[PDB]
Amino acid sequence: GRFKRFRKKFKKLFKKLSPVIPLLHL
Numbered sequence: 001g002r003f004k005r006f007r008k009k010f011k012k013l014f015k016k017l018s019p020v021i022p023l024l025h026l
Contacts, residue, residue, distance in 0.1 A: 018024055
């Protein structure tokens with residue numbers, strides 16, 4: 001893909017920002 005696959009890559013960085021807490025994300 002292109003911009004779509006790129007989004008998934010950037011999301012991986014955003015995940016690192018959260019303290020492994022699915023609560024703040026949900």
